[PDB]
Structure formats: C-alpha cells, structure tokens
C-alpha cells in the first residue's frame, strides 16, 4: 500500500507542469485528462493540484519513448504505459507517459490517458499497488466507462493526507 519508509508530500498544494504532449490527442483534451486524474485524489483529500506554465513543478509531466531522460526507459508498445516517482525532491512525483502507446479516452484501440494518469498520480502521491481487484491502484490496466475510486484507494490516500474538508 505505501513505498518503503512511506514517503509523502509535506504540504497540501502540489504544483504540476505539462512539459510536452502527444500528437494523439488535442492539447486541451490532454490538459483536461490530467486535471480529471488529479481530481479523483483531490475530491477525497485536502490536496489541491495547481498547474504552472514555467519553472520546476512538484510533478513534472512529459511524454517520451524508450530512454527519455531518467534511466528508466520505456519499452515500445504496451507493457510500461506510464511511470511515476514516489514523493520527494528532484524527480520525486514526476510522471511520464510512453508515447509508443496510442493515447485515447476510450476502449480497445489505445490506452485511456485519464485512467493511466489517475493510477500513475496515485504513485506520485505515495501509493503502492493494491491487491484489491476493484482498486484503481491494482496493477493491471482496464478501461472503465463509469470509473469510481474504490474504498481501498480512498483509505490509502486519506491515511497519508486526510479526508476532504467538504
């Protein structure tokens, strides 16, 4: 359920910056997908995720293929879809998406940028894999048309950061 030594953010505002995009979707639809992915965690905690348009954000977001700047290379089609670093300084929290995947918001012909980002941002906030088959933090991708964060996910994220104020 957590990384070794339970790293977490020691603040409630987490900045993020989208360094670059995929050509597979419109940029405003990518922005919206990342926003919605953060909101699944915002909604049940006091966390807020603020977009910045320059400088060093807590979560630097980018797309790449194979070796893309951190010595944990992507792998072409399928397998590694995205990866995130546990909370911390430098690369901590950074979330990368493999552009050898076809990015979509639906089923079958690619991977949901929304669902993959929500899972990866769970890692960026300090959650490890769940063994609860219904949890977003369960390790195996699926497309869900009616996505609902599980009580397992809510329990983990609240254990680190507490519950929503409202």
């Amino acid at each position: 359920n957590f990384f070794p030594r339970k790293p977490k953010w020691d603040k409630n505002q987490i900045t993020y910056r989208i360094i670059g995009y995929t050509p597979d979707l419109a940029p405003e639809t990518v922005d919206d997908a990342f926003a919605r992915a953060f909101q699944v965690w915002s909604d049940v905690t006091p966390l807020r995720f603020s977009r910045i348009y320059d400088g060093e954000a807590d979560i630097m977001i980018n797309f790449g293929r194979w070796e893309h700047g951190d010595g944990y290379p992507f792998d072409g089609k399928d397998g590694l879809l995205a990866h995130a670093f546990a909370p911390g300084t430098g690369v901590g929290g950074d979330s990368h998406f493999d552009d050898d995947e076809l990015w979509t918001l639906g089923k079958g012909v690619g991977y949901s940028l929304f669902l993959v980002a929500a899972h990866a941002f769970g890692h960026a906030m300090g959650l490890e894999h769940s063994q609860d088959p219904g949890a977003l933090m369960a390790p195996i991708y699926t497309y869900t048309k009616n996505f609902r964060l599980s009580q397992d996910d809510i329990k983990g994220i609240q254990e680190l950061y507490g519950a929503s104020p409202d």
């Binding site: 990384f3 070794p4 944990y72 792998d75 397998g79 590694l80 879809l81 995205a82 990866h83 995130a84 670093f85 546990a86 911390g88 430098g90 690369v91 901590g92 990866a120 890692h123 490890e128 894999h129 390790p139």
Partner: peptide, 7 residues
C-alpha cells in the same frame, strides 16, 4: 511492471 519508482 516497474511503474512506481524511487529518488
């Protein structure tokens, strides 16, 4: 696979 990294 290794989608959750430490550092």
């Amino acid at each position: 696979x290794e989608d959750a990294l430490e550092x």
